[PDB]
Amino acid sequence: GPEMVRGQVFDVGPRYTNLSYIGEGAYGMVCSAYDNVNKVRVAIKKISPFEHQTYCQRTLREIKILLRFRHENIIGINDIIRAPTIEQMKDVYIVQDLMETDLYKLLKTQHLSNDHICYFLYQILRGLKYIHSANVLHRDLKPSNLLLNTTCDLKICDFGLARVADPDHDHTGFLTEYVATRWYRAPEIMLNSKGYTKSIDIWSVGCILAEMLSNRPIFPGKHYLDQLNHILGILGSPSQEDLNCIINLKARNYLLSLPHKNKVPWNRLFPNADSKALDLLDKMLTFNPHKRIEVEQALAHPYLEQYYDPSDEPIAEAPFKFDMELDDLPKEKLKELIFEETARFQPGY
């Protein structure tokens, strides 16, 4: 029978054998496996989305985006295993290059040198530059979605929440639900934003930089709204100019109800950090998303001067485009699209 990892069956034989657990997500599990064809150990992610429409949308978007993308700092799809007929297909296995660890695991074991912080940050932004050049957003950047090896190569993974940027439809009401990981949410998520602009990813990168500098999450909110209070606990109360960009009266009245909070200087939090790193951090963790630094500007910052080189930083050929609007289609419709997108990998074809 097929192999089984922590109660989950990975029906990936006979090509991929000798499976071993690596990690897990909301509707996914990741193992390592030996590819008998290529004679290398790979990573395989089992995804089981078909009972829920939202999980099918995200599965389709991640597959279509990662099959289109090709970049050294972004995880790629080597192979997709599913059933020969649409009725036997209940799981999708995505085969990827195996990496050794992720940054979340690494930060539990070690304090990074400034040299390693700088190089990791460079690679995050180099990958992000490519993603944003395609008009795509990752929307869930965090240490556990940054894969590493012992030679300090970095790859961004887990594009389940990725979308094409859509600034015209970014506005939403106060206290709306959000799926991306709480500690890395920009303040506007809780006030007026759906996370449909590039500035959402820059904030998360700033949070990651803070964590590399200190091995502490900078904004560890205990609950949805407490997250915003922690952000203001460092940035201080927003200025009148920034207050005036929030039109939502419920959001604006909430901010005006808070006591005044002082801005906490970065070097109190990070007393041993490179001062150029803290200047870049300041520009990434700007309250106002319209004043927040953009990805190319971040790469061009003095902190990254020893690495920034546009002649060695690929961009996408053109903006990514979804043919049809995925938010409406029922999960049975979405399941057919996923079946079609995976046909090229099936034996035959």
Ligand SMILES: Nc1ncnc2c1c(I)cn2[C@@H]1O[C@H](CO)[C@@H](O)[C@H]1O
């Ligand atoms: N290719 C890979 N190589 C090594 N580990 C991997 C991957 C992939 I895809 C994911 N992971 C690990 O599993 C967690 C859930 O995606 C991630 O947070 C991460 O720890």
Ligand SMILES: [Cl-]
């Ligand atoms: Cl709350």
